[PDB]
Amino acid sequence: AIQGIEGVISQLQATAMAAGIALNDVMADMQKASVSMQMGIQVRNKLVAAYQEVMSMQV
Amino acid sequence: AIQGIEGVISQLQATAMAAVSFAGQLHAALDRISDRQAAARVQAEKFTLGEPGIALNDVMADMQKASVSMQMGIQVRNKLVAAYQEVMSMQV
Amino acid sequence: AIQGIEGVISQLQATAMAATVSFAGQLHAALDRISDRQAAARVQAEKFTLGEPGIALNDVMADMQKASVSMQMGIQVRNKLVAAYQEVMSMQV
Amino acid sequence: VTSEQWLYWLHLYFWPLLRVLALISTAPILSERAIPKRVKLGLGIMITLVIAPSLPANDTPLFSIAALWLAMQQILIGIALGFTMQFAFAAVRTAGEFIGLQMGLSFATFVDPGSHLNMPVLARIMDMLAMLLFLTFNGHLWLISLLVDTFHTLPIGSNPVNSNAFMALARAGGLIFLNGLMLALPVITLLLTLNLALGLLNRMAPQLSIFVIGFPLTLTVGIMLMAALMPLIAPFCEHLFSEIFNLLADIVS
Amino acid sequence: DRLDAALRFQQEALNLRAQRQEILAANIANADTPGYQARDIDFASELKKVMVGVALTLTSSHHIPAQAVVDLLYRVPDQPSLDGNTVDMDRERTQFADNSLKYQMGLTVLGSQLKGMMNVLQG
Amino acid sequence: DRLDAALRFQQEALNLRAQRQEILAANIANADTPGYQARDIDFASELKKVMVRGREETGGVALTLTSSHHIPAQAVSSPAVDLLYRVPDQPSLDGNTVDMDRERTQFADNSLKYQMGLTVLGSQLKGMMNVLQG
Amino acid sequence: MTPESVMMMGTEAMKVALALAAPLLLVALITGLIISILQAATQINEMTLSFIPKIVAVFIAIIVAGPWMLNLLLDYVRTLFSNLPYIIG
Amino acid sequence: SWSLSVQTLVFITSLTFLPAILLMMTSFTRIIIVFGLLRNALGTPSAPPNQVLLGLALFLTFFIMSPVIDKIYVDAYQPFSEQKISMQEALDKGAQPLRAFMLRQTREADLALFARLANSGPLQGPEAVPMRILLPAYVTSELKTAFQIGFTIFIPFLIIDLVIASVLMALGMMMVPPATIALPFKLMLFVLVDGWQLLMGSLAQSFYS
Amino acid sequence: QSWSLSVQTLVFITSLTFLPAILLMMTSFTRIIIVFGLLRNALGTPSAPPNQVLLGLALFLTFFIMSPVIDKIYVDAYQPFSEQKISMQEALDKGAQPLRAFMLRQTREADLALFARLANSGPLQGPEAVPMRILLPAYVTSELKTAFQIGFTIFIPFLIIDLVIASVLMALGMMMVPPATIALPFKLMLFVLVDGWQLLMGSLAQSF
Amino acid sequence: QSWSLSVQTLVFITSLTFLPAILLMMTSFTRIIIVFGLLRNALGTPSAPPNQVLLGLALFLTFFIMSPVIDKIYVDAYQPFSEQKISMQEALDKGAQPLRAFMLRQTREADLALFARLANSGPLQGPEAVPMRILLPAYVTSELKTAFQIGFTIFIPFLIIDLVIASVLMALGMMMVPPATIALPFKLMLFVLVDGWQLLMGSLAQSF
Amino acid sequence: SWSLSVQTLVFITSLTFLPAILLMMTSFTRIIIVFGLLRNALGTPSAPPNQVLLGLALFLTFFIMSPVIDKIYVDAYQPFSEQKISMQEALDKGAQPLRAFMLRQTREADLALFARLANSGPLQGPEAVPMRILLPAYVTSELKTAFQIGFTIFIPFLIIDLVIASVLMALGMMMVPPATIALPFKLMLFVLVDGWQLLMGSLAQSF
Amino acid sequence: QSWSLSVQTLVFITSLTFLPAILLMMTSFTRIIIVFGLLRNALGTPSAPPNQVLLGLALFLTFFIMSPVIDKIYVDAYQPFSEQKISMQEALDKGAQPLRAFMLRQTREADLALFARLANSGPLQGPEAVPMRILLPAYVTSELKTAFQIGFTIFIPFLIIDLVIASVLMALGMMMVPPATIALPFKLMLFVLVDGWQLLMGSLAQSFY
């Protein structure tokens, strides 16, 4: 993109300043997605529990 | 329906003016697996029939492939159900 | 019974006038289907063990395996129904 | 073939689900505990199923601090929307509780503040009347529509944020008081006059008045006054909802 | 039952293979009988016929249910014997071995179908 | 990213095991074809190569399908692995170097190593579900 | 369904509450005022003797008009529950 | 059609979503919300135990959804069981009576909103609405109807507390809790005016009207 | 005709899942537990006897009340079924009779009429024509109504004590005291001098 | 007659499941817990001693009170069973007797009569033959009544203190001064001075 | 860098203490106590719901932590991506702004008490105060500050109540309770001066 | 003599469940939080600091108080455990002794005597031979009594303020003025100027010594 090339030159300025599919793949990505979804569910559950504990307060 | 064809022409007019999904993918996978299994079964029945040209090697290999595909479908269903149960267990 | 014949004539009058799903009825019909399949396979094995002509061993084994598949069908449906009922009844209003 | 790329679908369906569910758990009527949890989760899931395919999918991994920042952003947006909506019901509850306290309904708070003995029954009456009015004016549909619309204004992707904007929501805490005063005003003032009248009676022969004649008279007068004042809340109800909604529209951006 | 319709073809093929196996072994056993004709069945036609009934009605409990109760083709002789026996050793030995092999194949296919139907259910 | 990087070594080793077993099965299939030099790959060097630079394919191009009625078709495709020749043991008049003892020993060894990779990857994934589950 | 129907719902409800509570409150108020004016006439002032007849009067009020309140409130609730499925939206 | 293994797999998988069908596609939500709200109203948060209310709601839903289930059985389950309609068409045939039942009880505003949110084309008649639009519209309409019913239910039980507090306050007993006095009177009211028959009949009419 | 033993085992072990549901909806557990909770609310203290003690006591009371019905079921269904004299389905049908009679004896007519209206029932006839799926919700509704009727009159004496104490305290002059605080010991005194627990169990048992 | 080992361990684990019910309905835990809750309510401090502290105190007091019964069960029943002298059935039957005697010692004859008449039991000669299904609910009811008696009696000194402070404040004209704020510190002082905690625990132990 | 699974375990475990972080480490206690005392001042203990007060305190806490959140983003969020610093050196580096903020808002007396409670003699410098000594001292300082702000809020409402009672007594009334008369005047004073916005401005200025 | 690794892991994880019980009945926590539960009552604000703030403050104060006991347990018992010079049984026997001494020094003799008599224990030669079953409930009883003593003493200055304010209000003829609302800000004044929180925590810590 024109804006994409703008971003490339921006990252160059940043550097300046700083100075078919098989079962093997199907199953592995399937498991990885299951793991990531479980992680997201657990993190959200922790956040929701913390929020409800905060809001169940008594001021 | 007459009103149904009216709706079809209306959607065609909509396309004129203006100028696949997960369930669809699962349906496609189920159809593919069932079609493979039916093809293997039909070839096996043809061999059992005595019709010429059908080799036992191909029958047995196709049955093997159909079994593997069925097992793949079973595993996908198992996981999918597990993920759905995990999502529905989330406390809101 | 006298009252039983009264009920028969009452059902005949009902048919005259006429000229409803049941989940319990459907479960009873399914359990009957499984039980008669198992009993038919068992009786076939009975006759084949007793030595009666006309019964084949491969048919005996195939009928037994069909009965096993039917019972597994029933067990899985039972598991799903019990899990659904428990999850519905574990909810709080 | 038989790809079914799972990460793409997960990243497409997750963050809109997080934002929708964050709004659901805090938005009034949609956040009431009487709804079973599974109903709320299913409503969020179905709304996300309808909305997400049109949105551009994000590719940030769930196993990164960027995912945590995204989740925090969605939670902040949802709770901000729900709470800004809840402010109006807070104002109505305040006005009702004050009318009830000028009724003398709960006199034990003036002597024992927060002593496990308080019944703001008028506050509850007007709170549920306000909920009924909000249901009638289809405010919840609007809330859902605005939850969808805040994407175009603020996309899922991590975007920079501002400051006094938060103050605005916090400064909305003034409205709860300011609008509450007006609703009361149409009744408390006359009640005040009534109390003033009772004072004139006590300027006569000492004692023998107040706590024996004032309470029943003022209770009946408050009852019939605000029973007549009931038709007045609905225009004020729409005014409160419009204030909350356009404040949300102006400040969320 | 739908379960019968799926397994009907293989069960009928297995039963027909067993019957033809019995017929071939009877041909082998009666090889020395003078005047015995070697009989056999056409597997495909009989399989069509079996693949392509009315249980009497039981009004009450005492009523008794209905009680239940192939065509043989002569083999074309190859060599003329003097005692009228047309059984040829080589032809029927090959047919016997082939029928044994096909019976094993049918058992394998039927077992695979049942095992698939089972692993669909197990869980 | 982190989870993808942590499980990438064993996943790539298992994929390379699969490709090596495909090659060994091809060698076993062509064991009686006259004039077929047995092919095999150096597992360690190719594994490190796939590790540093991602997996690539010789061609694997295919007809594009914009419409829903376009007929799908793909041309020949194969990995970017270096197919090396195995040194023959003893000469043969037909001219193939597929020595069956070597083929079956490599087949069994690759089989066990692929099962080992499956065991390691499954253990890691459970070792992670154990943490997440709650 | 319309907000006019809702606000009417609240008004009629709370007028029913007013009708239920008006006899008891008015009886108590009249008794208190009478006892107060008698105290003023007699020049007697104790804050406890006005509390005595009020309880008796208010309790008699349930004897006399209690059935009327019980019949009015039940009729209101019965009509509300019967008309519930026609004001649904 | 699908192979028998695939059909069995699909049947077993679809047996899982029964609670989802009961909660998001059935009359259960309104009844359970009304019961929870009524229990909140009478002041006994643990009175009819959750299991009793759940069983009553299940029986009410079974009695209410009877014509829809009958139509599904006569139109979809009967031809499917007699090998006249394939497994992948029985679902489509049976999803129509449930869709009609969900439509009648839904609301225009919700339908318009969820037709706009999907960026779908104009829907000139109800016959062009897909399930992806009707599902959440029906859910939102059911939630709003249940909350309306519960909030008009709540009014008398708060009226009684209001009058109790006012009467207590007339006599100067300012330190007497009003809830403890009002709870027996609320129970007496709910006993007198056929508390449950009227509520049961009102909910059932609320569905068939 | 009889079911196979595997089918019998499957049905028998599946039916044990509805044991809490049977105990709650179909037996006397609901009324007793509701009355006990209301009495706890009426005592002035919300959790004086732990929920566990009340639940166990209600279970024992339910067993004692239903013992005649259990005996009738055992004589009619359990004993002839275990001796292999009747089938499982016929045993269940025979054993449903005494429980149906027990449920009918405590069922309000209006509840049964309403739930027959909602189930499209037309010519019902004998009290012995009501199906189980119609009889059960009517019984539950009648039990809830009866429990509320018992609770709101259990509340009466404690309200009397509360009002008397509040009136005496305020008329005497001490209007700043909390009447409930002084009233709670007197509520306990009234409950123990009347033998409230024993009399309450007697009344609950004689309500059937 | 001796149960096989697998049946024995099945019985043991199933019985271990019922442990809280035995603690609540067969030991002295319920009465101590009720008295502690009423005492906490009586001081005007609804949450000063955390529930866990009072539960632990009640558990330790129950263990100390029931030590003689546990010793009798060990010596007479459990010890021969652990040395394989007697089977599990007879060991349980022998172990029931000391606990049954303890529960009969602390029950009221009226409640026993109520539950016997309710259960339609035949005439029973002496306390030797009374079924556990009859004794357990009667013992629970007697424990509830005794706990309420003790709590109501305990409520008296704090009532005296509240009344005297309210009267002292009222006689001074202080009409709008609430007496709870002044009474709570003096309730604490009264309970501290009389060595209230140890005295009340000693009184509870002595009543058993 | 240690194992990814251990990192996940630690992250999810630390997610549990989020209310502890909000209460003990941020200022949330101060705003919540100020809101409670202000509600007690107006004489209505249930006029704004506890939920609304909690959410308002949450929004105020988010704004007043926005500079510290920005410093955390600069020192921890960004360099964790460029991998110049990560895991240990960074979590502590990101927690450093919290340490600076809590040192700023903590009195010296509380820190001195909690040090002599831990026998930490050689604590000489003021930028190396351990978290164990810094946290409860900060909480106690927040309690004192919140009580002081609550008293300052109390002063005008107490003045209004006293004035109303004095005028009632001077006018001849001896039985009329002044709370009923003074409540609407308290509200009209609170609204007219726009008490809420100045209160939040002062709280933000109070740091 | 040492336990097996499986048994050691089982015992450790099982004993990890008793952490709240150990904290309440064996450490200082019981005396602290209870006093807080009374202090928030003395100030006139039951809301006060939130419950979680007070609980965590009590937890930190408890850790600071038991730092010497924890250090002694770590040195005498757990260090040989980590450095393999002791078993789990001997570690459990040895590590409890400093905690037993800490519990005994705050245990009133009367309560200890009461629980001995109630357990029918034989003649205990000296403090060192007191069983834990006798020391635990006696320590809890003495802890409750001491906490109530501290709370009642704390209740004094606020009572002084309330009495003075009420007397001033009544001496002026302002009889209808509730003095609680007036005296609450002055109670907050008293707690602020004297540095009530720091003084109270210092007093508690010194009391445990």
Numbering used by the authors:
A (entry chain Az): 3 to 21, 65 to 104
B (entry chain A5): 3 to 21, 32 to 104
C (entry chain A4): 3 to 21, 31 to 104
D (entry chain At): 4 to 256
E (entry chain A0): 3 to 54, 62 to 78, 83 to 136
F (entry chain A6): 3 to 136
G (entry chain As): 1 to 89
H (entry chain Ay): 37 to 245
Provide text from the study.
The bacterial flagellar motor is a huge bidirectional rotary nanomachine that drives rotation of the flagellum for bacterial motility. The cytoplasmic C ring of the flagellar motor functions as the switch complex for the rotational direction switching from counterclockwise to clockwise. The basal body is made up of the LP ring, MS ring, C ring, rod and export apparatus. Here, we present two high-resolution cryo-electron microscopy structures of the C ring-containing flagellar basal body–hook complex from Salmonella Typhimurium, which are in the default counterclockwise state and in a constitutively active CheY mutant-induced clockwise state, respectively.
To obtain the C ring-containing basal body–hook complex in the CW state, we constructed the constitutively active double mutant D13K/Y106W of CheY (hereafter referred to as CheY**), which can mimic CheY-P to tightly bind to the C ring and lock the rotational direction of the motor in the CW state. The C ring-containing basal body–hook complex in the CW state was obtained by incubating the recombinant CheY** protein with the above purified basal body–hook complex in the CCW state. We successfully determined the cryo-EM map of the basal body–hook complex in the CheY**-locked CW state at an overall resolution of 4.3 Å. The density maps of the LP ring, MS ring, rod, hook, and export apparatus in the CW state were locally reconstructed to the higher resolutions ranging from 2.8 Å to 3.8 Å. Although the structures of the LP ring, MS ring, rod, hook, and export apparatus in the CW state are highly similar to those of these components in the CCW state, the protomers of the C ring in the CW state notably undergo inclination and compaction, suggesting that the binding of CheY** induces significant conformational changes of the C ring for rotational switching. The motor spans both the inner and outer membranes, and consists of the basal body and several stator units.
